[PDB]
């Protein structure tokens, strides 16, 4: 839940406004003053995937992914950039490959034989982690991630011969990918083209010949190995040498685009008639993801320069820049319509036409799986520890959570919201303000739980636009990188549904020599503007991507957004080296169901280990967090209390008979759909076993005092409908899904509406 006043966009949300992206902190942004027509038909979207555990120890090299490890190690690792990293990799690669000894000394170790041939039978086995231990001393580095890449190289040429133990295994987690390129994500993905051409040379060494000459002859010296490695590692050193600075490949090729978009480009520097006609610029001219990248470029550098020869050289840059991105990468070009598919919109209309509130939401497919691991140290004061997945705890919850899944789907939240604004609104126009725009982004709040951050700094990042410094850099680096996704994800949306876009050039405050911002042509067919613009001509031209949303008609999301859980189960043996205590929630719970029977109070305590079938309380196990599940429920809570608040706010000032009865018509109808939902959770596997026990602690507490039995014609039912409801919270409480505070207010809402009173009123006949 994030609310903004679309009339004053500057103040309410500056993160999503365009005025911020191109460097206007001050309120002013130019009108539709000067313009050039354009159509964006393509975009660069990250492939749809989220982090997965990948294991580095085994002999294979999968160049695409090791590349991905560099992204994470350097970028999110706190280091400067993957660019500086890769450079320090090829100084490292030059060190070993071009050096004749370092390939002898560690083939003396693995083969055992310094000066003489080794037979075919007498071939020992040396575990992979071994040779790594020594290579550390030979070719020392400050980045362990290099030693792993060389280690499993020699493992690859020696694997057929069998000089090494297969059994050992080891594991890391690759990171999540931003869906749209930040400026630097271009620079990175260009260097990562070098790197991928590096590794594809190492990876592809068969050494079949060395396998043939070993078999027939029966023996070979280290002089055959230690050359045949040194031939491989210097084939890779070729392929690294002589590639262009990514930093100056892109910096230019985003400028010479930026000059053929902007209408005002001085003729003194005009991209020439040849490069405008270059093969491929045509396509890159119409591409969006670059544009919002360009806007970033100038936001930071403030300027641009073309170092490369304006003609002869810059026409071999582009065909090299295209081949970098176009090739399979995290970023793959797609028709623009598709990348926004999951966003959806709905609005609350006045009688005339214009919006009162208008909601924008990300659809979701609720994640119905959950896993629970127990961490196991290798030795005292060693951080290697590797977890054991425990089934039978997890089978419970995932068969418990699967019933929850069906009933919370996001579309049913907004389908509910607009049903509120129908009832609460008066009959009269809204001139008073632009229609406020509420936007659910469960992805925002989601990222706060896995990163463990106060939801208030995340929101307040979008509002004011600046990130708080008080937090440590690991968060801000994933915060800003996030806050840029939403910005981008907005404009892909706005553009997708208003194909007419027009590129101006901002120069009012003369902040930068080159600047760009779109302005949309949307045809409103409305009388009065929301936001502020002159609404002249039967179409409005609005620089802000948000306003240009508001004038859309309802849109139904065509594609469910997909969360997917991190997978521990597959590799059990491999030792986890990534910290897993960030993604782990402790699992413990206590609660008491209190009821009053014939003027006394009977309280049944209950513990979580009982609920699960465990007989004893085991401390170690830790539930791996259900973020996306806690994301949605968090949304659905805040929109529920928000609704139920706004009504009881109108319900006081209604001053009508016909309308007032329509509010209480709504609340009651709301709260007993609330409850029939929670009662539906009570029948679940944890819900069951919570009930069966709670009644049983209450019985044996009444043993001492003989008192008369109930009718249970409806009493069994009345008591039953109550005990289930308390199961409904207990299951939500014990998993992370609902915090204890909001669980209380959610009782209080269901409490005063006397929902339960009305639920039973359908089970009697009069």
């Amino acid at each position: 839940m994030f609310n903004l006043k679309v009339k004053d966009l500057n103040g309410s949300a500056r993160g999503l406004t365009q005025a911020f992206a191109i460097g206007e902190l001050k309120n002013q942004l130019s009108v539709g003053a000067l313009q050039l027509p354009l159509q964006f038909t393509r975009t660069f979207s990250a492939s749809m995937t989220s982090e997965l555990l990948w294991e580095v120890g085994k002999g294979n090299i999968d160049p695409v992914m090791y590349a991905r490890l560099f992204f994470q190690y350097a970028q999110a690792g706190g280091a400067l950039s993957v660019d500086e990293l890769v450079n320090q990799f090829t100084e490292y690669h030059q060190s070993t490959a071009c050096n004749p000894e370092i390939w002898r000394k560690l083939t003396a170790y693995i083969t055992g034989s310094s000066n003489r041939a080794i037979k075919a039978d007498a071939v020992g086995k040396v575990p992979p982690t071994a040779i790594l231990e020594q290579l550390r001393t030979l070719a020392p580095s400050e980045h362990e991630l290099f030693h792993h890449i060389t280690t499993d190289f020699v493992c690859h040429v020696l694997s057929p011969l069998g000089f090494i133990l297969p059994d050992a295994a080891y594991v890391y987690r690759v990171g999540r990918t931003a869906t749209y390129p930040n400026f630097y994500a271009l620079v990175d993905c260009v260097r990562a083209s070098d790197l991928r051409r590096m590794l594809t040379a190492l990876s592809s060494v068969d050494s079949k010949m060395l396998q043939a000459t070993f078999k027939a002859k029966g023996a070979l010296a280290p002089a055959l190995i230690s050359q045949h490695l040194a031939n491989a590692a210097t084939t890779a050193f070729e392929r690294s040498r002589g590639n262009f600075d990514a930093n100056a490949v892109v910096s230019s090729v985003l400028t010479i685009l930026g000059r053929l978009w902007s209408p005002s480009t001085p003729k003194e520097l005009d991209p020439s008639a040849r490069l405008r006609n270059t093969n491929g610029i045509d396509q890159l001219r119409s591409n969006l993801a670059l544009f919002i990248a360009y806007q970033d470029m100038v936001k930071q550098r403030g300027r641009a320069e073309v170092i490369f020869s304006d003609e002869e050289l810059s026409s071999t840059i582009i065909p090299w820049f295209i081949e970098a991105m176009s090739e399979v990468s995290p970023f793959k070009l797609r028709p623009i319509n598709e990348t926004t598919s999951y966003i959806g919109q709905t609005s609350a209309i006045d009688h005339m036409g214009q919006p009162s509130h208008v909601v924008v939401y990300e659809d979701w497919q609720f994640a119905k799986e959950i896993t629970a691991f127990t961490p196991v140290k290798l030795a005292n004061n060693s951080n290697q520890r590797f977890l054991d997945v425990e089934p039978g705890i997890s089978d419970r919850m995932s068969a418990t959570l699967a019933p929850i899944g069906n009933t919370f789907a996001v579309s049913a939240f907004v389908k509910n919201r607009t049903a509120v604004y129908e009832a609460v609104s008066q009959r009269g126009t809204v001139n008073s303000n632009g229609a406020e725009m509420t936007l659910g982004f469960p992805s925002v709040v989601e990222r706060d739980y896995a990163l463990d951050r106060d939801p208030m700094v995340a929101i307040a990042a979008l509002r004011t636009g600046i990130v708080d410094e008080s937090l440590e850099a690991r968060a801000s680096n994933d915060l800003k990188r996030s806050m840029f996704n939403y910005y981008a994800a907005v404009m892909h949306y706005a553009v997708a549904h208003n194909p007419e876009v027009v590129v101006s050039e901002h120069q009012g405050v003369a902040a930068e020599q080159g600047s760009l911002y779109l302005v949309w042509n949307v045809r409103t067919e409305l009388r009065i503007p929301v936001g502020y613009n002159a609404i002249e001509g039967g179409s409005i031209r609005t620089p802000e991507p948000l306003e240009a949303i508001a004038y859309n008609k309802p849109i139904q999301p065509s594609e469910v957004l997909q969360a997917k859980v991190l997978d521990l189960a597959n590799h059990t043996t491999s030792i986890h080296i990534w910290p897993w205590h960030e993604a782990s929630t402790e699992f413990a719970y206590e609660d008491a169901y209190s009821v009053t029977i014939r003027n006394k109070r009977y309280t049944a305590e209950v513990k979580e280990f009982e609920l699960l079938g465990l007989g004893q309380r085991r401390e170690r196990v830790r539930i791996l967090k259900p973020t996306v599940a806690h994301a949605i429920i968090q949304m659905w809570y805040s929109w529920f209390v928000e609704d139920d608040r706004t009504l009881a706010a109108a319900r006081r000032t209604s001053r009508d008979d016909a309308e007032k009865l329509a509010i209480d018509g709504r609340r009651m109808q709301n709260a007993v759909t609330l409850l029939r939902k929670i009662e539906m959770i009570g029948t679940t596997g944890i819900g069951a076993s919570a009930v069966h026990l709670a009644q049983s602690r209450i019985v044996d507490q009444m043993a001492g005092r003989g008192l008369i039995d109930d009718s249970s014609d409806l009493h069994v039912g009345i008591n039953r409908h109550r005990i289930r409801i308390w199961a409904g919270l207990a299951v939500l409480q014990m998993m992370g899904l609902l915090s204890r505070s909001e669980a209380e207010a959610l009782t209080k809402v269901l409490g005063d509406s006397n929902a339960l009173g009305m639920v039973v009123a359908t089970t009697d006949i009069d």
């Binding site: 006394k600 109070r601 009977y602 309280t603 305590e605």
Partner: protein
């Protein structure tokens, strides 16, 4: 004369929990105010 009185404790007991708890809870309230401030402050520093 204590018939009236003990029945009052056992009403308070059942609510809280075992008698041991109520003896604790009673102290928590009787406890000086500053301590509530102290604990709030450690949570302000991010300890739990």
């Amino acid at each position: 004369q204590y018939r009236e009185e003990l029945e009052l404790v056992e009403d308070a007991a059942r609510f809280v929990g075992g008698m041991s708890n109520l003896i604790r809870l009673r102290q928590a309230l009787e406890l000086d105010i500053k301590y509530y401030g102290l604990k709030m402050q450690l949570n302000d520093m991010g300890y739990r």
